Design a protein around this ligand. Structure first.
Ligand SMILES: *[C@@H]1O[C@H](CO[C@@H]2O[C@@H](C)[C@@H](O)[C@@H](O)[C@@H]2O)[C@@H](O[C@@H]2O[C@H](CO)[C@@H](O[C@@H]3O[C@H](CO[C@H]4O[C@H](CO)[C@@H](O)[C@H](O)[C@@H]4O[C@@H]4O[C@H](CO)[C@@H](O)[C@H](O)[C@H]4NC(C)=O)[C@@H](O)[C@H](O[C@H]4O[C@H](CO)[C@@H](O)[C@H](O)[C@@H]4O[C@@H]4O[C@H](CO)[C@@H](O)[C@H](O)[C@H]4NC(C)=O)[C@@H]3O)[C@H](O)[C@H]2NC(C)=O)[C@H](O)[C@H]1NC(C)=O
Ligand SMILES: *[C@@H]1O[C@H](CO[C@@H]2O[C@@H](C)[C@@H](O)[C@@H](O)[C@@H]2O)[C@@H](O[C@@H]2O[C@H](CO)[C@@H](O[C@@H]3O[C@H](CO[C@H]4O[C@H](CO)[C@@H](O)[C@H](O)[C@@H]4O[C@@H]4O[C@H](CO)[C@@H](O)[C@H](O)[C@H]4NC(C)=O)[C@@H](O)[C@H](O[C@H]4O[C@H](CO)[C@@H](O)[C@H](O)[C@@H]4O[C@@H]4O[C@H](CO)[C@@H](O)[C@H](O)[C@H]4NC(C)=O)[C@@H]3O)[C@H](O)[C@H]2NC(C)=O)[C@H](O)[C@H]1NC(C)=O
Lengths: 208, 208
C-alpha cells in the first residue's frame, strides 16, 4: 500500500558535539482521504518519544510527503544502536516498520594526502588542488577546504568508493585561480571521521 | 503488477565500431495465469522490426521475466536518437512504454592529467597513482591503466561527479608496489569518450 524510507544522520552531525544529528523517516504515496499517520520511534526495541513530525507538503502527483525526525545522541549512533521507525494508520492492513544503524566493524583511520596540479594543467586559467583520503571505515566522512581559516567553497568531493581491502577512498577537488596558486597561498584539506584523534585532521598544500 | 526496465548500451560499445551496442527491455513480475507478452520498438517514434525477443524465463517467485534486445547503430546513439520499448499484455489495463537516449547537451572533451603519489605516502609499502579526468559531457566514459602494454588490474575509479560548470569529472586510483614506482616503470591512463579524437587519449606517468 505505501513505501516507507529511513535515513541516517549526516557524517558531520555525529562527529561534533555542537551539531545535532537526526534520523529521518519519510512516507511518500499518501492519498487525500487518510490525513494523520502514527509515528512510533525505538532505540534497541526499547521505546523513546523524543520525536517531531514536520507537517506535510504539496506535490505534483496528488500524494503528500509526511516526515518524522528523531534527534539521537552522538555516542549512541557511533556505538551502533538500532533505530526503528514504525508508521501506523487505518488504510494499511498491518503496520509498516524500518530499521537503520551504523555499518558494523572495526573503525579505520583515514590517511589524507594532498596533490598539486599536474605540470600540463599549468597552461590553464583555473587549476585543480587534490586531496586523496584513503583507508577509512566506515564510509561516513566529511571533507572541506580552507585558506587562512576562511572557507574555500569552489570544490567537489567524490562519493566514497569501496577499495580492494574493504576500506573506502575518495578525492576532493578544489578549483582556484592559477594566480593564487603562483603567489604561494597555503590551501588546507580538512577531514572529519570517527577513527581520527578528536574526529579531525588537516593537511596543508603549497608550491614546494 | 508488471514493471518494465530499459538499459542503455555500455559506454565502450558505442565508441568502438568493433563492438555491438544494444539497448535492453526487461519485463518482470509477468503473471502465470496470463503470460502472453508483446514488444513494439520505436527509434525517434518510427517503429523498427529487427529486435531479438527471448522466450519467457520462470523465476523462483511464481512469475516470468521476458527480455527483448534491440541492436543500435553507433552513430544513431551518438546522434541522440530516442529508443522507445512498448510492452503489451492481454490481462493489463494499458501498455507500459519506456524511452531512453544519450543524455542531452553539447559534448565536451576530457582533459586528462596524471598525478604521482604524495611524498607523505612514499613511506608505505604501496603508493597511489592518480588519473584526473575533468571537463567531459556527457558522463558516459571508460577508464583503464596499463604498464608495458599489459592491463594493471589493481585500480578503482570514482563514479562521474557533476562539477560546477555543468561538466563531469572523476579520478582513477592505481595502487602499485612502491618498488616498481622507484625503479622508473611507466604507467598509462587511457580514456574513451565521444568528444576525444578517435574516441581515445592516453596520459603516461613516471618517476621524475
Ligand atoms: C510522487 O512523486 C514523489 C516525488 O517525486 C520526486 O520529486 C518530484 C518533485 C519530481 O522531481 C519527481 O520526478 C521525483 O521522483 C515520489 O516520492 C519518491 O518516491 C521514491 C520511490 O519511488 C523515493 O525514492 C527513494 O529515494 C531514496 C533516496 O532518497 C534521498 O535522495 C534523493 C535524491 O536523489 C532525495 O529525493 C530524497 O529526498 C532523499 O534525500 C535524503 O533525505 C533526508 C531528508 O528526508 C536527508 O536527511 C538526507 O540528507 C537526504 N539526502 C540526499 C542526498 O538527498 C532511495 O534510497 C530509495 O531507493 C532504495 O529503495 C528502492 C525501493 O525501496 C530501491 O529501488 C533501491 O535499491 C534503493 O536501495 C535499497 O532498497 C532496499 C529495498 O527496499 C532498501 O530496503 C535498502 O535499505 C536499500 N539498500 C541500500 C544498501 O541502500 C528510493 O529510490 C523518494 O523518497 C521520493 N522522492 C522524494 C523527492 O521525496 C512518489 O513516490 C510519487 N508517487 C508516484 C505514485 O509516482
Ligand atoms: C520476482 O523475482 C524477480 C527476479 O529476481 C530474481 O529472482 C528472485 C526469486 C531472487 O532469486 C532474486 O534475488 C533475483 O534477482 C524480481 O525481479 C527484479 O525486480 C526488481 C524490481 O522489482 C528489479 O529491480 C530493478 O533493477 C535495476 C538494475 O537491474 C540491473 O542490475 C540488477 C542488480 O544489480 C540485475 O539483477 C538486473 O538483471 C540488471 O542488470 C542489468 O541487466 C542489463 C540487461 O541485460 C545489462 O545490460 C546490465 O549490465 C545489467 N547491469 C548490471 C549492473 O548487472 C534497477 O536499475 C532498477 O532501479 C530503478 O528503478 C527503481 C524502481 O523503479 C528505483 O528505485 C531506482 O532509483 C532506479 O530508478 C531509475 O534511476 C535511473 C537514474 O538514477 C534512471 O535512468 C531511471 O529513469 C529511473 N527509473 C525509475 C524511477 O523508475 C530496479 O531495481 C530487478 O532488476 C529484477 N530482477 C531481475 C533479475 O530482472 C521481482 O521483483 C520478483 N517479484 C516480486 C513480487 O518480488
Amino acid at each position: 500500500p505505501s513505501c516507507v524510507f529511513l535515513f541516517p544522520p549526516k557524517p558531520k552531525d555525529t562527529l561534533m558535539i555542537s551539531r545535532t544529528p537526526e534520523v529521518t523517516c519519510v512516507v511518500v504515496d499518501v492519498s487525500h482521504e487518510d490525513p494523520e499517520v502514527k509515528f512510533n520511534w525505538y532505540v534497541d526495541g526499547v521505546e523513546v518519544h523524543n520525536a517531531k513530525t514536520k507537517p506535510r507538503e504539496e506535490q505534483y502527483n496528488s500524494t503528500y510527503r509526511v516526515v518524522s525526525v528523531l534527534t539521537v545522541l552522538h555516542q549512541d549512533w557511533l556505538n551502533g544502536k538500532e533505530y526503528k521507525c514504525k508508521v501506523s494508520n487505518k488504510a494499511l492492513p498491518a503496520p509498516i516498520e524500518k530499521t537503520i544503524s551504523k555499518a558494523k566493524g572495526q573503525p579505520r583511520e583515514p590517511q589524507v594526502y594532498t596533490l598539486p596540479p599536474s605540470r600540463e594543467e599549468m597552461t590553464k586559467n583555473q587549476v585543480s588542488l587534490t586531496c586523496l583520503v584513503k583507508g577509512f571505515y566506515p564510509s561516513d566522512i566529511a571533507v572541506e577546504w580552507e585558506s587562512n581559516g576562511q572557507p574555500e567553497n569552489n570544490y567537489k568531493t567524490t562519493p566514497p568508493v569501496l577499495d580492494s581491502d574493504g576500506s573506502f577512498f575518495l578525492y576532493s577537488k578544489l578549483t582556484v585561480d592559477k594566480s593564487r596558486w603562483q603567489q604561494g597561498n597555503v590551501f588546507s584539506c580538512s577531514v572529519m571521521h570517527e577513527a581520527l584523534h578528536n574526529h579531525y585532521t588537516q593537511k596543508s598544500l603549497s608550491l614546494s
